[PDB]
From Swiss-Prot:
Organism annotation: Homo sapiens
Name of the protein described by the UniProt record: RNA-binding protein FUS
Underlying gene: FUS
Protein origin, superkingdom: Eukaryota
Residue window of the full protein shown: 37 to 42 of 526
Disease: A chromosomal aberration involving FUS is found in a patient with malignant myxoid liposarcoma. Translocation t(12;16)(q13;p11) with DDIT3. A chromosomal aberration involving FUS is a cause of acute myeloid leukemia (AML). Translocation t(16;21)(p11;q22) with ERG.
Its job: DNA/RNA-binding protein that plays a role in various cellular processes such as transcription regulation, RNA splicing, RNA transport, DNA repair and damage response. Binds to ssRNA containing the consensus sequence 5'-AGGUAA-3'. Binds to nascent pre-mRNAs and acts as a molecular mediator between RNA polymerase II and U1 small nuclear ribonucleoprotein thereby coupling transcription and splicing. Also binds its own pre-mRNA and autoregulates its expression; this autoregulation mechanism is mediated by non-sense-mediated decay.
Length: 6
């Protein structure tokens, strides 16, 4: 998974 700001 991805968590945060892109």
């Amino acid at each position: 998974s991805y968590s945060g700001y892109s």
